[PDB]
């Protein structure tokens, strides 16, 4: 049982990096419209508290946020991500958010040390 | 000298990273416009050439590729990658390639295992 419990403590669980960048998007953009001079500010906060919020698990993990916001004129979005790594500790996120206005998708890579 | 030569075996050059960049997407998109339905596969055959270019280099390091399109209708482009890392052993090179219609933006983490 202690296993399982080291074991999950140490592990980079989905739903909680997941509800991090959720919580960050939900704070940093909120329901505000589309700005290109606010696109600097919300995506600097969303990298920041999402990395603030990775850090405070204590999980020995290196953590990449990378984010993206985009502005709903018609065109598709695709975001790919192919990586290669030791999939029994290393992890990743993709949370896709949008709105009336912009598309939001931001990735968080926590790699063990 | 040998000592040198061994750091610079063992370091995550910028350059060769972006060469390889290029010439994945270069391979995989080259002077073909953009089409929605076909965003999938640039973005796929990008990062996979860009990974497998990586691991012939034979670096001992985690790589993480993201590759992403997007349309030249007026939408706003930005991307920001600030992370957690070692930065004496690990680096990132973030290469922004774009035509008359067509932007493709790809990212590299190298990280040590």
Same mark, same amino acid.
């Given at each position: 049982?202690?296993?399982? =419990?080291? @074991? +999950?403590?140490?592990?980079? #669980?989905?739903? $909680?990096?997941? !509800?991090? #960048?959720? $919580? @960050?998007? +939900?704070? *940093?953009?909120?329901?505000? *419209?589309?700005?290109?001079?606010?696109? !600097?500010?919300?995506? %600097? !906060? #969303? #990298? $920041? =508290?999402?990395?603030?919020?990775?850090?405070?698990? /204590?999980?020995?993990?290196?953590?990449?946020? %990378? &984010?993206?916001?985009? =502005?709903? !004129? /018609?065109?598709?979005?695709?975001? @790919?991500?192919? &990586?290669?790594?030791?999939?029994?500790?290393? /992890?990743? &996120? %993709?949370?896709?958010? +949008?709105?009336?206005?912009?598309? &939001?998708?931001?990735? *968080?890579? /926590?790699?063990?040390?």
């Amino acid at each position: 049982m202690e296993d399982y =419990q080291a @074991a +999950e403590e140490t592990a980079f #669980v989905v739903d $909680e990096v997941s !509800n991090i #960048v959720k $919580e @960050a998007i +939900e704070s *940093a953009i909120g329901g505000n *419209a589309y700005q290109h001079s606010k696109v !600097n500010q919300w995506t %600097t !906060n #969303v #990298v $920041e =508290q999402t990395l603030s919020q990775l850090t405070k698990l /204590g999980k020995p993990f290196k953590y990449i946020v %990378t &984010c993206v916001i985009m =502005q709903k !004129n /018609g065109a598709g979005l695709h975001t @790919a991500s192919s &990586c290669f790594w030791d999939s029994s500790t290393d /992890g990743s &996120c %993709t949370v896709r958010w +949008e709105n009336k206005t912009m598309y &939001c998708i931001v990735s *968080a890579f /926590g790699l063990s040390i």
